[PDB]
Design a protein around this ligand. Structure first.
Ligand code: 0G6
Ligand code: NAG
Lengths: 253, 36
């Protein structure tokens, strides 16, 4: 996160750390959608151009964290993965279209004050909130700056959703319907963005109807971090909901 | 667990369940041309 703040304790209880076994390292963010399922960015597991192809065995997931590096004794839960599921039509070749994946935990996690799932939007929630000008919140343990680093605690930033057209005209990368972009326009004089290490984390909104937090996006890609005239791109979660529903219902939640 | 996830989904034990607010959640609601 660039230009964010330290999260408050229990602010994002659905936040998960994607952790590499050896060398031990922070791969990406992730979010808990139930006691057994985690949602992330597919490019966190598979990115052939960089020789990246992680298997269940290579990783661990850490839940209920605040600190980037301390082991939070009596707070955090660490789990092993039963199975990884990448969107069959994830496009690593050109533009990260369908940059999404589900992870099945080896055993369910017990909820607590620091651990609790977020909701997945339904067509109407999605319809009412996914509007230019509406703000969401992003969180993560990624880079503080474009290049220089790592925060000591979980960072948070609230950003506005931007009009599809301004999104398109900011990059030469081919934007699809499975993506949305977010940030402040340069006049707007107010910054913040996700950055490298932030992928897989959630873009969430609070419903004004029922007060619940919904995950609307997943941190996906960008060009540099917090640059003026540029924006962050997110996997559009409602659009990929059928797939999501489908894997959970075969592979059983 | 999926659709609007679990059942208790999105309700934070230390904020929503206690009826407490986080420092910047207002900024979100005010953007939905002022929440609820
Ligand atoms: C894996 C993630 O941590 C990461 C998130 C970066 C977020 N950036 C901003 N400013 N919000 N994504 C990446 O690093 C992805 C994966 C592969 C390349 N990539 C990029 O973001 C490139 N900077 C741009 C890009 C390259 C190829 C295809 C899509 C985008
Ligand atoms: C990733 O590795 C697995 C074996 O672990 C292999 O089946 C898969 O084909 C690899 N992916 C490629 C490079 O797309």
């Amino acid at each position: 996160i660039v230009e964010g703040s330290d999260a408050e304790i229990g602010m994002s209880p659905w936040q998960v750390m994607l952790f590499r076994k050896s060398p031990q390292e922070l791969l990406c963010g992730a979010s808990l959608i139930s006691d057994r399922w985690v949602l992330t960015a597919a490019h966190c597991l598979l990115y052939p151009p960089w020789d990246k192809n992680f298997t269940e065995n290579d990783l661990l997931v850490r839940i209920g964290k605040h600190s980037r590096t301390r082991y939070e004794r009596n707070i955090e839960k660490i789990s092993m993965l039963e199975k990884i599921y990448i969107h069959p039509r994830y496009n690593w070749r050109e533009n990260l279209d369908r940059d999404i994946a589900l992870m099945k935990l080896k055993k369910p996690v017990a909820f607590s004050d620091y651990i609790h799932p977020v909701c997945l939007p339904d067509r109407e929630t999605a319809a009412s909130l996914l509007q230019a000008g509406y703000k969401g919140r992003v969180t993560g343990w990624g880079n503080l700056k474009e290049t220089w680093g790592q925060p000591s605690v979980l960072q948070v930033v609230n950003l506005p959703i931007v009009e599809r057209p301004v999104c398109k005209d900011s990059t030469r990368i081919r934007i699809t319907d499975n993506m949305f972009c977010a940030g402040y326009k340069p006049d707007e004089g107010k910054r913040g963005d996700a950055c490298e290490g932030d992928s897989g984390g959630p873009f969430v909104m609070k419903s004004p109807f029922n007060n619940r937090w919904y995950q609307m996006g997943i941190v996906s890609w960008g060009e540099g971090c917090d640059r003026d005239g540029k924006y962050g791109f997110y996997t559009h979660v409602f659009r990929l909901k059928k797939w999501i529903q489908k894997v959970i219902d075969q592979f059983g939640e | 667990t999926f659709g609007s996830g679990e059942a208790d989904c999105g309700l934070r034990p230390l904020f929503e369940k206690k009826s407490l607010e986080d420092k910047t959640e207002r900024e979100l609601l005010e953007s939905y041309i002022d929440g609820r």
